[PDB]
Ligand binder design. Structure first.
Ligand SMILES: *[C@@H]1O[C@H](CO)[C@@H](O[C@@H]2O[C@H](CO)[C@@H](O)[C@H](O)[C@H]2NC(C)=O)[C@H](O)[C@H]1NC(C)=O
Ligand SMILES: *[C@@H]1O[C@H](CO)[C@@H](O)[C@H](O)[C@H]1NC(C)=O
Ligand SMILES: *[C@@H]1O[C@H](CO)[C@@H](O)[C@H](O)[C@H]1NC(C)=O
Ligand SMILES: [Ca+2]
Ligand SMILES: [Ca+2]
Lengths: 230, 213, 127, 230
């Protein structure tokens, strides 16, 4: 049984570390005795809403143990105990938070849309550049004015290895908006959820005017007395 | 491993074709694992046919017939002149694939003809970038351009005329290959001068330049 | 160190950019943009038609000045290809250009011949 | 199992159409079949062009067949039969060119590194925003001063669909340069190759001097006697 571990994006959207022992590589059979047991020697209330039978060389019973954040990062080797006809033994896979990963915080940079994008006047793409973070578990969500946008409006790439740094990763997430919305001036906050951040959330913001003043020094020279030479 | 000459055959042009190689009267052809554009920049330098454009490792239908695969391996920097200036160490090493041949589409070299005049040393300027002859434009024309083009013509030095004979030697017709050509005075020829892109002109045919020397 | 960003001699706009080495820290060095625009007070709306009315409104789309629609060459590993430098393009000419000579044709009559002779709207341009 | 097609990256950079399927070392086999068979049935011959060098490394090889004709560009049901006696089920993979995909030209935007990133004075990440291309495959290479930069300097993402667009894709390319290169004003050019481009390659260049200015000084010299520019 291939038990998918709860990723940080999965435990951040739900605020509940629901680790799943989805019954993979075992076909549909009888003798269901699926139980999630903690490594101390006990078990909790487990598997609310398991799905029906799907004999496409697998099953669909899902682990739904609502253990906590202080439970998952405690390092307790949680084991699911799926038994079936093919193997009459609990398939106790070892799932826990690995301690070998380094913990370097993201350096989140929020590049504004290019001036050509607003010049084309159909779309503006604000790109969040989450770079320099060591565990490849980042959840990026965008808020317009403090409330989240829909996940269809932004797309976040998978964490890919930063090439110059040894084991740090990087990830870029764009949000394609209309040019008229960006010209009004909105906050467009990029919230980055990661374990190594001091408060587990950083937030960056770009408005229409997010840089320096760019002070103008215009000179209407309205005579030929001060007119230029060549 | 002595590459005396690398002829270009089976192609529409004298120096657009597949790469052969000659050693000791045996006409042979070259495969290569790393066969970059810089290798073609060498190949169409020892033949003196322009700059290198395209380098295809393009196969064809197997009934073409072909010479065997050249024994050594040829990987070098590309800024050199001939196929002897760079080493060809691993002799007898044939690690190309089964039936493929290379290809080079380097340009026909820059032939420059002073046309429209009574002698070949005095006329309107016409150049050959592609297969089509064409004039050049006089945007920001300078005496450095005149001395460079007269040095390339092999016809002495310019005299900087009073523009009347240049306007009397013909407007010309066709296409304008060069605009805003700018020579530093030290380049061997007109290609090595700074210019706008070939065939992109903001001038009509009334502005075709003529150089007198 | 004024790098010439555009040198448009048809609208007379010259844009030059430099990094002013203002302070010791390498970040607050101001990217300075020098737009120099010569406004011809008496040139007509159509420069090639000298009977055109006087040009009063001088609009300068600075993105249209800064477009580079001459394809450049790039050197790949196996190829040299022409490369477009902009997405903008696919001309008012407020001022004459020095390198370009502009001619208008006038109806000249002596005995009703109406021999249409070209003038020189800019003298000392093609002489 | 994998059968990587020639994309427009392999078509344009190398000018050689190489059909390639990777046979990972599931089990060591003497006569490894990586026979690249056409829908017609003739097999352009490939065998062990480069070893896979997987962490197990038990008789694993890569077979690259140079079907370089117009039959791939027109399209055919090319199949390499990874048939093996060890694990006797043949783990073959079939790949064809995707047919009739509409062609939209990429709108390429070069984003300079953030003002937040240059304050760290450690590294600068230049973003090439290739977006709006509806054929999926795209080739992005960075050059500095006309020389191709090393592929370890930049990392380009897989194309993912643009959110608001129906089937148009977007891609990133993050070039990680040191800050002392970008603050001195070095031109980093983004060369991007796509099928729908008119000249097939677009080159965006960025550097500090173009950038976004922080002090426009304009001089509208309104001279009566301008006439011709000088
Ligand atoms: C600007 O003026 C020139 C000269 O009068 C115009 O060019 C002529 O335009 C007419 C009508 O379009 C043509 O019949 C002539 O053949 C043109 N002559 C030349 C030498 O080009 C030009 O059209 C005017 N442009 C504008 C925008 O008004
Ligand atoms: C713009 O400011 C600079 C100093 O930063 C000054 O030298 C220059 O004269 C100003 N331009 C004007 C007044 O047109
Ligand atoms: C911009 O300021 C510089 C001073 O650094 C000055 O020399 C230049 O003339 C100004 N630009 C224009 C267009 O006047
Ligand atoms: Ca010109
Ligand atoms: Ca001229």
């Amino acid at each position: 049984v291939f038990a998918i571990p709860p990723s940080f994006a999965s435990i951040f959207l739900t605020k509940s570390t629901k680790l799943t022992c989805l019954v993979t590589d075992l076909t549909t059979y009888d003798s269901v005795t699926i139980s999630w047991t903690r490594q101390n020697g006990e078990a909790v209330k487990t598997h609310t809403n398991i799905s029906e039978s799907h004999p496409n060389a697998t099953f669909s019973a899902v682990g739904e143990a609502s253990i906590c954040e202080d439970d998952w990062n405690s390092g307790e080797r949680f084991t699911c105990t799926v038994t079936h006809t093919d193997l009459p033994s609990p398939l106790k896979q070892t799932i826990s938070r690995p301690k070998g990963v380094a913990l370097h915080r993201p350096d989140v940079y929020l590049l504004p849309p290019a001036r050509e994008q607003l010049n084309l006047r159909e779309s503006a793409t604000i790109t969040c550049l989450v770079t320099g973070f060591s565990p490849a578990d980042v959840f990026v969500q965008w808020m317009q004015r403090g409330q989240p946008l829909s996940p269809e409006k932004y797309v976040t790439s998978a964490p890919m290895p930063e090439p110059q740094a040894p084991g740090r990763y990087f990830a870029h997430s764009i949000l394609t908006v209309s040019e008229e919305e960006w010209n009004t001036g909105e906050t467009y906050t990029c919230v980055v959820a990661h374990e190594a951040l001091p408060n587990r959330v950083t937030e960056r913001t770009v408005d229409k005017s997010t840089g320096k003043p760019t002070l103008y020094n215009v000179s209407l020279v309205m005579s030929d007395t001060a007119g230029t030479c060549y | 491993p002595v590459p005396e000459g690398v002829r270009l055959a089976d192609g529409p042009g004298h120096c657009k074709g597949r790469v052969e190689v000659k050693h000791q009267n045996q006409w042979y052809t070259v495969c290569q694992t790393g066969w970059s554009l810089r290798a073609a920049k060498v190949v169409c330098r020892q033949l003196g046919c322009g700059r290198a454009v395209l380098t295809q490792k393009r196969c064809n239908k197997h009934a073409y017939g072909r010479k065997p695969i050249w024994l050594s391996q040829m990987s070098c920097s590309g800024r050199e002149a001939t196929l002897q200036d760079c080493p060809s160490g691993p002799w007898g090493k044939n690690t190309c694939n089964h039936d493929e041949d290379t290809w080079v589409e380097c340009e026909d070299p820059f032939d420059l003809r002073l046309v429209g005049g009574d002698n070949l040393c005095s006329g309107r300027l016409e150049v050959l970038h592609k297969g089509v002859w064409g004039s050049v434009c006089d945007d920001n024309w300078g005496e450095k351009e005149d001395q460079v083009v007269c040095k390339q013509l092999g016809c002495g030095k310019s005299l900087s005329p009073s523009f009347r004979d240049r306007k009397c030697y013909g407007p010309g017709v066709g296409r304008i290959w060069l605009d805003n050509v700018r020579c530093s005075g030290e380049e061997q020829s007109l290609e090595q001068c700074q210019h706008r892109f070939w065939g992109f002109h903001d001038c009509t045919h009334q502005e075709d330049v003529a150089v007198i020397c | 160190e004024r790098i010439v960003l555009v040198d448009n001699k048809c609208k007379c706009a010259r844009i030059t950019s430099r990094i002013i080495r203002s302070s010791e820290d390498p970040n607050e060095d101001i990217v300075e943009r020098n737009i120099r625009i010569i406004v011809p007070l008496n040139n007509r709306e159509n420069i090639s038609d000298p009977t055109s009315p006087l040009r009063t409104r001088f609009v300068y789309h600075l993105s249209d000045l800064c477009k580079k629609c001459d394809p450049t060459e790039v050197e790949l590993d196996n190829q040299i290809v022409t490369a477009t430098q902009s997405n903008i393009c696919d001309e008012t000419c407020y001022t004459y250009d020095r390198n370009k000579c502009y001619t208008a044709v006038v109806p000249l009559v002596y005995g009703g011949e109406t021999k249409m002779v070209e003038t020189a709207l800019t003298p000392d341009a093609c002489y």
